[PDB]
């Protein structure tokens, strides 16, 4: 189903500074995971000031079962 907030935030921590305005890789190898990006309109925000709810966009990724 939908990746949890816990999952997405864990993933944001794992990708650290590779987070960018481009969609990340899928967070998983099998099943459903998340991809994340810095919202286009937030590209000028210092990384340390990015807000999970308002500056990070999310999309589900569906890998093979």
């Amino acid at each position: 189903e939908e990746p949890s907030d816990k999952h997405i935030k864990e993933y944001l921590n794992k990708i650290q500074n590779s987070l960018s305005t481009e969609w990340s890789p899928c967070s998983v190898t099998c099943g459903n995971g998340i991809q994340v990006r810095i919202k286009p309109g937030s590209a000028n925000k210092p990384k340390d000031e990015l807000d999970y709810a308002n500056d990070i966009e999310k999309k589900i990724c569906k890998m093979e079962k």
Partner: antibody
Amino acid sequence: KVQLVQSGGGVVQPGRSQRLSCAASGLTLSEYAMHWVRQAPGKGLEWVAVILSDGTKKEYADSVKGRFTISRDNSKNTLYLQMNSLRAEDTAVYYCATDDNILGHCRSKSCQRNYYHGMDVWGQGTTVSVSS
Amino acid sequence: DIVMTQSPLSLPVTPGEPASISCRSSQSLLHSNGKNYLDWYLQKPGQSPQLLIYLGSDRASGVPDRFSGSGSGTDFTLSISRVEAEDVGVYYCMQALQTPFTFGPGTKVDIKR
């Protein structure tokens, strides 16, 4: 670059069929729900159909239901529109466009958060002219 | 189906002056998740449509600052702080709340001389 490359279309007689293609390059089609949108000559935009990233939950505008069907082949990074029983009303430029909301959350079922960020990538358009 | 209306339908803009386009929906586009499912697209002459604004107020990638979207529920506005020659074309709002997605009729912008 990131591109949707459309092909197909051209002149087709009323009642005949045409199949449109929309091939992605620079992006992975399986990461998108995909839409068709069309524009009759001199008129506005009209939404035609959508298909989720895994091919499920195909949906159609009332104006085409029963005659058009949407399909995709993620392994070929390509989206299709099959158009049967074409009418003069169907003459238009047809566009494909992307949607990050791969599985229809929020708009079709409950969601914990939004996944839609507009239809950001558009093909160059395919002209379909329905005429005898 | 949700019905979308726009005003004005024709919008000439003197160079240097701002412009504003109104969009109304027949049903609220505010979702329980807090987002307003309203997009704005521009179609320049002979070109495919391109995304300007999504979710009411978010700028798409590559969209200049002069474009901004505002509003909520059934009442939305596209504001263009200035209209360059490259901004001429037809502006459409579109609701993305539920299928069928539906578009406004279009507002045609040109340079006022």
